[PDB]
Design a protein around this ligand. Structure first.
Ligand code: 3VB
Length: 315
């Protein structure tokens, strides 16, 4: 019979919106019904959504948490009712969950900042666009960015602020920074591609181009920016793969089947060197890719390498 898995995401970001197709594909191949909800970047709303899924007696719950330091009563309630609660993509600061399917966000932060350090030759002024404040990917990517910045004291941070993963909020923040700092800005380090693209749109609207921008995710428009040189690079977080892996882990936990409950998604570097294959998987041959996805996920669960999808460089 049908395994009902609740999924409550922080918001319908570009990453989550594209990723969900991977979840759908794995679910069709495994008779899983997804019970969906999005929490508007509101912790109390997400809490209520988890509570509702518990009351509905779903077989497992995936949470993509608004903030890391939250949801303790929902975590305990799920455990109390025997329902596996599995943070996927963003993390909770709790060990009372049933599984945990996460990217290495500290590593991705460091990787993006290292791309920017290389481009700049270790010197220059940057601004940093952050994810939602208190969300694990914001905290972790900040940590990784700061660990590289320590190694490059001639790189100076002019400002940093959140744009909540959103392109339109990033345009706004960048427009203000252009008015404040103008020609001092030598680079933009965006904690995701969407915010990088907003920064790009702001720069262009002010008549400035060729400013180095780096992002994380490799969404369609980010990959396109890498190809065209509007971005210096990105880090692939293919949500069709990572979210389907989280779904697979939750499904096996729901059914009492043996599984690695805590695989980690290592984001490969995307540059002009390998962007074409990423574009094939994510954009132009996406249906080919999805046709092989269930097999890929099932293998990757046993190797632990849940990011593997044959991007040149991966082994
Ligand atoms: O889903 C949260 C992050 O992993 C993602 O990078 C946001 O675009």
């Amino acid at each position: 019979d049908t395994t009902r898995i609740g999924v409550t995401v922080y918001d319908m970001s570009s990453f989550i919106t594209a990723g969900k197709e991977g979840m759908d594909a794995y679910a069709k191949d495994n008779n899983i019904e997804l019970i969906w909800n999005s929490a508007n970047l509101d912790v109390s709303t997400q809490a209520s959504q988890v509570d509702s899924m518990i009351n509905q007696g779903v077989d497992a719950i995936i949470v993509v948490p608004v903030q890391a330091d939250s949801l303790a009563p929902q975590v305990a309630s799920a455990k109390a009712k025997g329902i596996p609660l599995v943070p996927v993509n963003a993390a909770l600061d709790s060990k009372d969950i049933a599984g945990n399917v996460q990217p290495d966000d500290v590593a991705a932060g460091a990787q993006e900042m290292q791309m920017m350090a290389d481009r700049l030759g270790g010197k220059g002024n940057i601004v940093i666009l952050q994810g939602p404040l208190g969300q694990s990917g914001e905290l972790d990517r900040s940590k990784g960015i700061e660990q590289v910045l320590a190694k490059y004291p001639d790189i100076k941070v002019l400002a940093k602020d959140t744009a909540n993963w959103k392109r339109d909020e990033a345009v706004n923040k960048m427009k203000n920074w252009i008015s404040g700092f103008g020609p001092q800005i030598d680079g933009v380090v965006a904690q995701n591609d969407d915010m990088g693209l907003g920064a790009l749109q702001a720069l262009k609207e002010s008549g400035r181009t060729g400013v180095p921008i780096v992002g994380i995710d490799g969404i369609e428009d980010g990959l396109n920016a890498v190809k065209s040189g509007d971005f210096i690079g990105t880090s692939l977080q293919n949500g069709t793969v990572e979210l389907a892996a989280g779904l697979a882990v939750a499904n096996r936990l729901a059914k009492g089947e043996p599984v690695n409950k805590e695989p980690v998604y290592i984001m490969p570097a995307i540059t002009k060197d390998n962007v074409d294959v990423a574009i094939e998987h994510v954009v132009t041959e996406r249906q080919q890719f999805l046709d092989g996805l269930t097999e890929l996920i099932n293998k990757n669960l046993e190797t632990g390498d849940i990011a593997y999808e044959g991007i040149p460089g991966q082994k």
